[PDB]
Amino acid sequence: TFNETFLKAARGEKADHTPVWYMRQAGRSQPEYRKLKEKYGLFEITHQPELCAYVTRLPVEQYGVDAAILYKDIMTPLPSIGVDVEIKNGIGPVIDQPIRSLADIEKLGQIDPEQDVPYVLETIKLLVNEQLNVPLIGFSGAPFTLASYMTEGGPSKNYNKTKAFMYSMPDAWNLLMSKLADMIIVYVKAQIKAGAKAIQIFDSWVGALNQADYRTYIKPVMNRIFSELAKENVPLIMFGVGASHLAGDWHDLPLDVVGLDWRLGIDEARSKGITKTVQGNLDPSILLAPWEVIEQKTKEILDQGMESDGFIFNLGHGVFPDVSPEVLKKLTAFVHEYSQNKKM
Amino acid sequence: TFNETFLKAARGEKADHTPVWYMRQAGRSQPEYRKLKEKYGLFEITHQPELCAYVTRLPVEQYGVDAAILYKDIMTPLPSIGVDVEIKNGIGPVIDQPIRSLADIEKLGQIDPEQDVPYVLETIKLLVNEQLNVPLIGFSGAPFTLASYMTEGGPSKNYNKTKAFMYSMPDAWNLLMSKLADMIIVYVKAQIKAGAKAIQIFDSWVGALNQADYRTYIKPVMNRIFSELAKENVPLIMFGVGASHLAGDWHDLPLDVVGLDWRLGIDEARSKGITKTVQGNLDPSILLAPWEVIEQKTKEILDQGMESDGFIFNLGHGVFPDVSPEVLKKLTAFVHEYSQNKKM
Lengths: 344, 344
Prior knowledge:
Two copies of one chain form a homodimer.
Chain A: H1 5-10, H2 31-47, H3 49-63, E1 68-69, E2 85-86, E3 94-95, H4 102-106, H5 113-116, H6 118-130, E4 136-141, H7 143-152, H8 160-168, H9 170-193, E5 198-202, H10 211-217, H11 219-229, E6 236-239, H12 247-252, E7 257-259, H13 266-271, E8 277-279, H14 291-305, E9 311-312, H15 325-343
Parallel strand pairs in A: 1-4, 4-5, 5-6, 6-7, 7-8, 8-9
Antiparallel strand pairs in A: 2-3
Keywords (chains A, B): Cytoplasm, Decarboxylase, Lyase, Porphyrin biosynthesis
Subunit structure (chains A, B): Homodimer.
Function (chains A, B): Catalyzes the decarboxylation of four acetate groups of uroporphyrinogen-III to yield coproporphyrinogen-III.
């Protein structure tokens, strides 16, 4: 039987229990992911269908979560438009020559996912048409986050170079946003057609921006991306850490689910007119506290979230490497058992 | 004439212009600092009073800012109570064995500033009695932030080990908050006594905490600190980046000035009931944009700020190495000119 719990919650419909999944549920927290990675390498496991499919499905099998998140690199579509993502082991995909001028942006092309990223289309097809009895979430990075990779080149805590570029070259910035939007929409559209039943947009670094600059430089292209993607008739989610101050503006966009970090609580969100379905809150660092703490913190979040039907439980950030899979197994059952009891 | 503009604004009293200073105005943004550092080394520059005083006064002389911030390392008072320091510099100052048990906390001593950090006292006296025509701001790190350095040891992005500790062992955590409070109060008191006319507490990493955890584990000890320190009759400021969601709770404390990062706007803070004097707010990354963008974004902040007497202009974080002194000199003149024109 197909588990519809996640999609019911995503569209604010009644369901029997609260659905769960975790950002980075498939990844370094799992002993088998690591082993597979050291055996086949990052490239084969981000690019080989039989392998990507295994990594994606594992957490579902091991935790009994209500959704699978497609395992792949956030930078996957970039080479299609002419940006070369290189690197070399432990800090793999990095960008050789950063965006510096308007002429760099003008030479950017277009994705043809059927031809350019066939391996991801095939993985989705294998997973959806043949493997999962749980919905598959496809994903893409957002424009700001992708532009930050393309513009910093090297690693950044503050995103000064990216933001200075944004401020100094508004016209170039707008064109870059447009080129990336083109790519994101086509990339996401192909993921949905191949089987994906929801999509999450990760805007990991956009919390570096205040509300004023989000609206000036970022909000319009986001409006374009979600307005287009809404025609695909699948739940659209957005998450980025440290971006609580941007929740209302995200709520304005034609997305369906607003992902929260641990600094905007559910009652607080509703109290601010956040009315669409809400995703996750649990601070990932709590997963390292004694069970007493995990439970008290999780029960509080569930209690608030179960006030309406539009609620998916998740963390307020990604699972990190030294999180115990045993803790995630136990957490997932607690959420399921606690919520279904409540909903009886 | 001594320039008292800064102190008036902090007390929410009428002044003829808006006072300005910048977090990290003395540092690697300056050629003189960089040369001084390669000449004498980090230790000499943070320990010889004549060098520390030079470092501290240089931005005042170069830019004409309205206050000096004491140049010293944030770890300064920690060896005095028995914690490790020094190291490699690449990744900051390292702490050997981190706090793990209650015994590790129980063994911590008390600071005798005269005996322990006399060079800081000497620097403050040199500056105030002989050099500065501008208030000297003293400073200390906050308990949470200082606790974080002591518990992570290494370089941290999300402070999971500290949070884990705080949750797992709350009794020990209270004792640590208590031991750090004591040190901070005596340290700050001594800086006031040497001649500091204001005090800034830096809680750099506290924004990792949501409101509930702030109230449970941090608000009590902070209330104690500002209660005791309020008795000195000097303006008390608190800043920490990424902490806009905690600004209401800081405003509750007997401090005088709320420091804002760029994500809580001035008007916005006022409508949220933040009524006490407010400091700073310009996104430092704007300093790399063309002058016209800088002037315009600053003017937007000044217009909000000048709605009450309680307003000190600053950045929303610290000056970073790539910032031009020319820019900061020109920004300082503008803030003075614009506000004076507007106030007259």
